[PDB]
Amino acid sequence: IPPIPPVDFAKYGEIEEVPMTRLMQIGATNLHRSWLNVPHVTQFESADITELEAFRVAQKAVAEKAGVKLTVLPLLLKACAYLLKELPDFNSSLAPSGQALIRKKYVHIGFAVDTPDGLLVPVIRNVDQKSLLQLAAEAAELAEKARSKKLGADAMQGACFTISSLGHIGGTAFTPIVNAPEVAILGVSKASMQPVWDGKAFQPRLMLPLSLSYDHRVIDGAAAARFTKRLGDLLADIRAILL
Amino acid sequence: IPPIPPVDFAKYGEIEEVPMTRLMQIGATNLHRSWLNVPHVTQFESADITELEAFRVAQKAVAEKAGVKLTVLPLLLKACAYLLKELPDFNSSLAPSGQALIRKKYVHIGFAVDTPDGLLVPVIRNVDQKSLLQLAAEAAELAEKARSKKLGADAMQGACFTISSLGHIGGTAFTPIVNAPEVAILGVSKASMQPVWDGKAFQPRLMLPLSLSYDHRVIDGAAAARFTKRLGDLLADIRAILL
């Protein structure tokens, strides 16, 4: 690939060199590998979480008695494990022969944690089998160990899908990069009150923006649109997961 | 126990004798055995199923595509399996020594089916592991086999709890009899729109009457009141089962 020409940055002013942690460097390398290997498409959708939010906030009592904080992330994780079982092409990887997909029969999901040293994506195993408070507990633990560098490499392996939530900082949407060999990643941004037409007038609903980037070699456009739609449907009523 | 004195019923008019099926006779014997063995108390409660009902009716599409009918019974079964795990004294039986309880670590639940020949209580095994459409399917099958006498005795054993639903016929409440050796039975009657005080005015809510009869040797009053309360809470918001 052509290299970027070097520039004497100091011709233009004072410069200072700060170095990259080995974590940054690793991260850099892996992102570039994915970028060049995966033809990326991002599919955007908005989900109506007005009722999810109300539920979340009402279980604050129960969550506190169990020692967890109930955030949107366990809810996101549960709904995506369910969908990853329904739409198995999203829970698979392109086999090295380029002619086969390896469908995984297990659902382990990573979530992005931004730490001082760089990005870590701890993995929760068998998300499909854990309850909302189990997942809330575990997510937090893995997050604290990640910030504290106490996260052992084991816990960073064998994920099937990644959720990257920036909803806590802000933004309308973004286009995340697929962590190959996985085939998709869900970016989640800040929720806003939006007017949503009820057939007769505009009702304020709390809308969560979802950005699903996918490996277009493995997932086609219609499959991805169907995935964010189902997910919008599941978050609008999490009871459908009970069915 | 003193016998009832025989009466020449024909002194008062024309009488006709019809006989009892062996099923009726079996049933009669077992009910009398429970009645004399179990000091019975019934605890009454009403649950707000307005939102459960809305969910039920909205999933009519999905249920039809799967070939099942989604009634309140799978919803009742799921919520009681969850509670039977939370409050284990209800999932147990008095040991023959009278000095021990046998806590069952499994949740199988029977439901009453009234057939021409008498009452049958088919049992669904491991209710705690099945989904609302699995349970809707299975309930129906066992019900059809029961009406058709094709229900094999195997499927009538080892239940932990019984639900008796008369909601489809009518009534406000009733006092069911415990099927010993089980320690409790949930009677469910017809749902009505009721005014429920919201703190400022009376709101119409769809209320389902619950009548829990229990073996007072094993379950005390406070435990039973706590069970129907939790159940009223779970049916008012089935998403708490996800937690």
Side-chain angles (χ1 to χ4, degrees), chain A residues 1-21 23-59 61-63 66-68 70-98 100-143 145-149 151-243, chain B residues 1-21 23-59 61-63 66-68 70-98 100-143 145-149 151-243:
Chain A
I1 67 177
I4 304 300
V7 183
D8 194 281
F9 292 119
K11 301 185 193 269
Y12 306 113
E14 228 273 278
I15 58 168
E16 172 196 35
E17 285 159 76
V18 303
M20 257 161 74
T21 57
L23 227 190
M24 265 166 243
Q25 298 171 248
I26 289 307
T29 299
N30 288 305
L31 293 169
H32 202 204
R33 215 216 293 280
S34 291
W35 181 249
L36 295 175
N37 269 95
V38 181
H40 290 70
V41 179
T42 303
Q43 170 71 52
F44 300 103
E45 185 60 278
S46 285
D48 192 333
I49 53 153
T50 313
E51 290 312 320
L52 238 221
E53 184 61 10
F55 172 74
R56 224 209 81 224
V57 147
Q59 301 310 313
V62 190
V68 303
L70 193 59
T71 44
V72 79
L73 217 228
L75 294 157
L76 238 27
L77 291 171
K78 251 260 159 289
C80 291
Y82 185 86
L83 268 182
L84 238 29
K85 279 263 192 66
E86 185 184 304
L87 298 170
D89 283 336
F90 284 89
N91 191 25
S92 78
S93 302
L94 205 47
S97 42
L101 282 87
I102 292 160
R103 270 140 74 135
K104 303 178 197 186
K105 304 283 212 173
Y106 50 93
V107 188
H108 310 149
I109 298 180
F111 60 100
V113 179
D114 281 294
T115 88
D117 255 48
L119 170 74
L120 290 182
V121 185
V123 175
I124 296 174
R125 305 283 163 113
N126 298 306
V127 180
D128 60 328
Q129 281 161 25
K130 297 181 178 183
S131 72
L132 293 169
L133 296 181
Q134 290 183 67
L135 297 171
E138 200 172 335
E141 181 189 281
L142 290 175
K145 293 160 152 57
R147 281 183 203 111
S148 311
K149 295 88 193 298
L151 189 66
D154 169 60
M156 238 117 63
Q157 263 127 239
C160 312
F161 183 91
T162 299
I163 294 175
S164 182
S165 176
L166 302 180
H168 54 102
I169 300 165
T172 273
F174 62 117
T175 54
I177 286 170
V178 180
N179 297 314
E182 294 167 35
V183 102
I185 182 176
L186 210 230
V188 184
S189 295
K190 203 206 199 76
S192 331
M193 209 80 213
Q194 288 306 328
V196 180
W197 184 247
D198 79 303
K200 209 71 175 181
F202 284 107
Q203 243 48 276
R205 288 325 224 86
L206 183 69
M207 297 283 123
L208 177 66
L210 303 167
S211 313
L212 175 86
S213 297
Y214 52 91
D215 185 334
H216 200 356
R217 299 173 302 183
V218 175
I219 284 135
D220 60 85
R226 200 162 299 285
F227 184 101
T228 43
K229 195 231 183 66
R230 286 292 285 142
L231 185 58
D233 290 344
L234 287 180
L235 297 182
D237 197 356
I238 202 74
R239 300 179 297 202
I241 269 172
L242 245 23
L243 217 50
Chain B
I1 67 177
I4 304 300
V7 183
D8 194 281
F9 292 119
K11 301 185 193 269
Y12 306 113
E14 228 273 278
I15 58 168
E16 172 196 35
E17 285 159 76
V18 303
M20 257 161 74
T21 57
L23 227 190
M24 265 166 243
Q25 298 171 248
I26 289 307
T29 299
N30 288 305
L31 293 169
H32 202 204
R33 215 216 293 280
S34 291
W35 181 249
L36 295 175
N37 269 95
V38 181
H40 290 70
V41 179
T42 303
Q43 170 71 52
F44 300 103
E45 185 60 278
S46 285
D48 192 333
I49 53 153
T50 313
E51 290 312 320
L52 238 221
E53 184 61 10
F55 172 74
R56 224 209 81 224
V57 147
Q59 301 310 313
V62 190
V68 303
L70 193 59
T71 44
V72 79
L73 217 228
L75 294 157
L76 238 27
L77 291 171
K78 251 260 159 289
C80 291
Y82 185 86
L83 268 182
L84 238 29
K85 279 263 192 66
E86 185 184 304
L87 298 170
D89 283 336
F90 284 89
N91 191 25
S92 78
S93 302
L94 205 47
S97 42
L101 282 87
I102 292 160
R103 270 140 74 135
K104 303 178 197 186
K105 304 283 212 173
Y106 50 93
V107 188
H108 310 149
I109 298 180
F111 60 100
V113 179
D114 281 294
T115 88
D117 255 48
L119 170 74
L120 290 182
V121 185
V123 175
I124 296 174
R125 305 283 163 113
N126 298 306
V127 180
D128 60 328
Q129 281 161 25
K130 297 181 178 183
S131 72
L132 293 169
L133 296 181
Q134 290 183 67
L135 297 171
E138 200 172 335
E141 181 189 281
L142 290 175
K145 293 160 152 57
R147 281 183 203 111
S148 311
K149 295 88 193 298
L151 189 66
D154 169 60
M156 238 117 63
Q157 263 127 239
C160 312
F161 183 91
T162 299
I163 294 175
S164 182
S165 176
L166 302 180
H168 54 102
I169 300 165
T172 273
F174 62 117
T175 54
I177 286 170
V178 180
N179 297 314
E182 294 167 35
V183 102
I185 182 176
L186 210 230
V188 184
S189 295
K190 203 206 199 76
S192 331
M193 209 80 213
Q194 288 306 328
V196 180
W197 184 247
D198 79 303
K200 209 71 175 181
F202 284 107
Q203 243 48 276
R205 288 325 224 86
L206 183 69
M207 297 283 123
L208 177 66
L210 303 167
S211 313
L212 175 86
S213 297
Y214 52 91
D215 185 334
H216 200 356
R217 299 173 302 183
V218 175
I219 284 135
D220 60 85
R226 200 162 299 285
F227 184 101
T228 43
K229 195 231 183 66
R230 286 292 285 142
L231 185 58
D233 290 344
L234 287 180
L235 297 182
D237 197 356
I238 202 74
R239 300 179 297 202
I241 269 172
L242 245 23
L243 217 50

